[PDB]
Amino acid sequence: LHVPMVDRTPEDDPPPFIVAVVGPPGTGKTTLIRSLVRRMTKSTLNDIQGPITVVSGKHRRLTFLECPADDLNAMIDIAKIADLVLLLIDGNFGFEMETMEFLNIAQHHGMPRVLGVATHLDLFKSQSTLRASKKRLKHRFWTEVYQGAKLFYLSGVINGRYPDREILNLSRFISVMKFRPLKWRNEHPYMLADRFTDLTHPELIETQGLQIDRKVAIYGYLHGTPLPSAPGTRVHIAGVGDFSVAQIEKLPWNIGKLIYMDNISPEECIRRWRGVDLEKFVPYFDTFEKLAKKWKSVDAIKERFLSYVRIVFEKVPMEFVKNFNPKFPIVMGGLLPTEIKFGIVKARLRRHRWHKKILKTNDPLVLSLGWRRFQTLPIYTTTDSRTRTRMLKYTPEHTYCNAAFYGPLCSPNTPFCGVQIVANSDTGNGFRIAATGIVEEIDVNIEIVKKLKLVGFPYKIFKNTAFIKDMFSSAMEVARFEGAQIKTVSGIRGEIKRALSKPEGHYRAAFEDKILMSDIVILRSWYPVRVKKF
Amino acid sequence: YSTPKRPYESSRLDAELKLAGEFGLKNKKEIYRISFQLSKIRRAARDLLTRDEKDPKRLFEGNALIRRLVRVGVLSEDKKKLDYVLALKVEDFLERRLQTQVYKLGLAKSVHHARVLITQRHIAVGKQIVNIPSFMVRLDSEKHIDFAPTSPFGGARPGRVARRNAARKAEASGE
Amino acid sequence: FGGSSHAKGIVLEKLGIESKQPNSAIRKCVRVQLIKNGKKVTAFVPNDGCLNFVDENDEVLLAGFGRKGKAKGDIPGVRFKVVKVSGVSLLALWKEKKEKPRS
RNA sequence: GUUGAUCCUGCAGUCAUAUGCUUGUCUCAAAGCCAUGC
RNA sequence: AUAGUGGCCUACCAUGGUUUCAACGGGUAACGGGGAAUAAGGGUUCGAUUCCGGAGAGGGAGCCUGAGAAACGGCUACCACAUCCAAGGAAGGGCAGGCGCUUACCCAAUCCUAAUUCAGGGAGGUAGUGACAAUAAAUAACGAUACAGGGCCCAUUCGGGUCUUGUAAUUGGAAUGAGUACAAUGUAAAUACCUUAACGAGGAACAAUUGGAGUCUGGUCAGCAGCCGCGCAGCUCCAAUAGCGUAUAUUAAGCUCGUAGUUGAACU
């Protein structure tokens, strides 16, 4: 409530409205984009150099964003931060099982003001049956998904697209209807990059090598909480890693001064102002005689009773200089203590919708924790008696496990996103979803119960007087373990009486019932061996 | 149509399974429409019973009540004295539908296959191919109940699905 | 309720029950404070699981038991149940007909 | 004109509020905030 | 005085004028009715009326055109009021409309006008919009053979009655149209609507449920020994049908007198 409340007041016209046009790359999104800026700038601009600042009135500034479905990371990255998702559809999607999984991504990141727009339906259909198909796709989304949504139907009038009332209806819905707040995004200061400049500290032999990082000066406008609150703080760059800011800049007898001037002793602060160790809890007082004489009278206490930024970096290093490009949009993240630190963390999980595989402990996963994403080996476990007694190596339809693994440690227990990577030539989206839930709880230095089974088959049994034909082969092991308590698969207690000088599996052992020949004498509580670290 | 007062009355629900299995129905609201049609008629018959004999309202509309029932085939000839329409039964209404009367005129060999015939643009009353199972036969088009000129068993076209079996033989055994 | 048929509240904590059939497993209750009133009332979760699903601190919807108060079976003293957490209609999440939002 | 026993039988309606699932074909369903213009 | 009689307005003179089968005065939140419908004509809905009247075009006054405006969808001036500024000045009237509870096309019709056989008509005509209701009905039809029967019902019972029955694509030809498409009609230019050559079934079909039960089948747990034991996944039946449920509420079993007040004999 308060974390959404701090966002509404300082933000005005120079912080723009976040616009993310996200759809399939096969469609002509660019015509609708340049049509949208034909509504903004007078009638005459149809060139794309985005992202860039477009000044349109004092009401709202609007910066427009785009990303293809062929890029994998920004498919994650734009979803948690967008105030507006504009989905354009073709007339042949809806049970396309490989290129529509981003809907679940926007679900798990949280739904902003989102849009469905149908334009290639004009290019595909030419009969009266499209009116039923429009309503059917409306029964698919978003009206199935969220109540109060609108489906926009527009013309295929490719280059040469209208300036007329339809773009004023789209921009009517964009300009009038505003967003809904997000919990942990507003808990952090985050800045999208707008202008990207590079300074090299002019030419020297130290300005280039195998390892040389230069002075990257980056610029833009702020969103969320104000980022200048502490200099030299930590930061995350998505896809590259964690860093700290080199220098932060922003372009939109006084005792309180005497405290934090550290070149002055505190006796000089008191002495210039008026007129040692806190390990002693009892405060200072005067002498018993002076305080007694002064407090002969008690009169003296008788009333006591009844935004633009200019940001400096000495990063990135040399290898990402070769990774320069026209800017596919990168937002800046924010690192925090009790989240920057590492630890074993336990997460609660469930299975993806329209998902067709099992999820094993041994197949590493990409994990979206806030602004972070880590490939990590997902070790599973379950309880069956309000405590851990077993573990599982894969994820069936039967139950759904809880994950325990060494990752980064995060106390506030953020929501969870577990994505399995596919290549850019397998299905059609940058990732395929494995599991989702919340970070359950924080637990380091914990140990998993890994129990196993020892096989012993009974054949002719009495209660206290019994032999097994084959469960062991050594009398010394049984002699070491005669003090233990042996079990049976139906739950019959027992203990080893003695190996009785027979290293053959025959040995005297007691039970509290005669063991069934359909039952098996077993042993549990086995070795808990270590976590996979990665 | 209208719903009855009791939703679960077992021997009442016994005979509803009897008639719908007899007459080849598919809904109980189909039964409820026939009873609701009867409910208004059998209402108005009591009102003319409260009137005097040879009352011209009882003479005009009471005998027009007769002639509408003599037309549809329900009312017999001997019982044309305004009292059998109080002593009626609902199965006489279910008798007069063309769904069963085509089976009463042989030719259908099932009460369920007959419904299958009706929906497939079969039997024309005269020149009028009808696709409504609730016609309430006019009692004079009964012998005119006959197949269409098309839609075979009335001939003049085999139909494309018989032409596929014609094509499956003439191309495989032929060329 | 104030005589009403439904009300909207927020989960503050999640309790634990147990069962007898087919084994002993937790059957789940919670404590939900009314938004309009501030009264915190116990509520039951009729399903298997769904302790996984609901949460602490979520804004939920409440309904009755259809016995005019009057706790159903061996559940001592609960008079209400949850049908919609976050307005998502639990049964939709029960098969997989819906996916839970950001919070 | 008055006491007891034996036998037998007995001891659902709501277009009226909100909500959920699904529908091949046909028909019928303010004294607040402002998009836009003079 | 006006287009025109006329207190319509003024100077003088008179003191009159209306009304108990009721002048005037007062209420009817229905701005006025004829009129359209169900058809008691009573009533209801509309009178913001399908036709006409009174009031308003930010608020005042004067004046103009036309046969006809009392133009305001005429002008000027005044008052409120506000946009630009080269700094001089210029200009518009506080107005619609949307949400809170997406509007496109044509003068082909009817009439009107015409600089009138031409053409136009913010007259007029066509298109968009959908479970609170609701209409018609599609999901399979008919044969075939072979091994086969501890088959069903009722009484939770103790038991009795009735054995015409299924397990198999064994398998076979029918068939229609959901949907795909020339041509024609229509033609506001014009679209839909009503027609129809040519495609479209052997169960993955051309993909229906919300449910209700269940003494069934499976999985190491309060807690215990001397001996014996505790409590998701496969299967079956029932339901109405594009319909059904849920929650709430609702329906059916101390004494007396004595005022206002009530009541009351017979009769040529």
List, as one string, the DSSP characters of C31-64: EEEETTT--EEEEE--SSS-TTTS-SS-EEEEE-
Cis (ω within 30 of 0) for the bond into C94?
no
Chain C residues 1-30 with a CB less than 8 Å from chain A: 26
Residues 6+ away with beta carbon under 8 Å from C90: C47, C50, C53, C82, C83, C84
A30 is in an annotated binding site: yes
Beta-bridge partners for A509: A496
Q: How far is CA A364 from each of CA A402, B155, B169, rounded to the nearest angstrom?
A: 16, 70, 60
Handedness of CA A202, A206, A210, A211 (dihedral sign): negative
Tokens of B102: 């085509």
How far does CA C75 lie from the centroid of its chain?
13
Handedness of CA B28, B29, B34, B38 (dihedral sign): positive
For chains B and C, tell me whether 3 or more CB atom pairs sit within 8 A of each other. Answer: no
Beta-bridge partners for A432: A420
Residues 6+ away with beta carbon under 8 Å from A274: none
Tokens of A74: 């920004």
Pairing of strands C40-44, C29-34: antiparallel
The alpha carbon of residue A23 is apart from the nearest alpha carbon of chain C, in Å, by 21
Q: What whole-number distance in Å separates Cα of residue A490 and Cα of residue A397?
A: 26
Q: Are A249 and A42 in contact (CB under 8 A)?
A: no
How far does CA A186 lie from the centroid of its chain?
14
Tokens of A482: 């005669």
Domain total for chain C?
Answer: 1
Q: Are B102 and B114 in contact (CB under 8 A)?
A: yes
Residues C15-26 as b or e (16 or more Cβ within 10 Å = b): eeeeeeeeeebe
Report the distance from CA of residue B61 to the C1' of nucleotide E267 in Å, as an integer.
63
Q: DSSP 3-state assignment of A515?
A: coil
Report the distance from CA of residue C55 to the C1' of nucleotide E239 in Å, as an integer.
37
Handedness of CA A277, A280, A281, A283 (dihedral sign): negative
Q: How far is CA A310 from each of CA A195, A246, A334, B44, C30, rounded to the nearest angstrom?
A: 10, 11, 17, 92, 50
Whether chain C has a CB inside 8 Å of the CB on A3: the answer is no
Q: How many pairs of residues across A and C have Cβ atoms under 8 Å apart?
A: 27
Q: Are A141 and A93 in contact (CB under 8 A)?
A: no
Question: Does A415 contact C102 at a Cβ distance shorter than 8 Å?
Answer: yes
DSSP H stretches of helix in B73-122: 91-95, 98-104, 111-119
Edge-to-edge order in the sheet of strand A215-224: A241-244, A234-237, A331-332, A189-199, A215-224, A308-313, A247-251
Tokens of B73: 């085939």
Q: Are A217 and A312 in contact (CB under 8 A)?
A: yes
Closest CA to A485 of A524, A449, A515, A528: A524
Residues 6+ away with beta carbon under 8 Å from A452: A524, A526
Q: For A273, phi and psi rounded to 5 degrees?
A: -85, -55
Q: What is the resolution in angstroms?
A: 8.7
Q: How far is CA A376 from each of CA A224, A230, A435, A444, A534, rounded to the nearest angstrom?
A: 30, 32, 13, 16, 6
Q: What whole-number distance in Å separates Cα of residue A293 and Cα of residue B60?
A: 128
Q: What whole-number distance in Å separates Cα of residue A494 and Cα of residue A465?
A: 11
Q: For A120, phi and psi rounded to 5 degrees?
A: -80, -5
- In chain A, the residue whose alpha carbon lies closest to the alpha carbon of C16 is A386
DSSP H stretches of helix in A125-216: 130-140, 165-176
Strand D: list protein residues with Cβ under 7 Å.
A 59, 132, 136, 139, 144, 147, 168, 171-172, 175-176; B 3, 5-8; C 5-6, 83, 89, 91-92, 97
Q: DSSP 3-state assignment of B63?
A: helix
Question: Does A183 contact C103 at a Cβ distance shorter than 8 Å?
Answer: yes
Asked if the Cβ of residue C52 lies within 7 A of any atom of strand E, the reply is no
According to the entry, how was the structure determined? cryo-EM
Question: Alpha-carbon Rg of chain B, whole angstroms?
Answer: 22
Q: Which domain holds residue C12?
A: 1-103
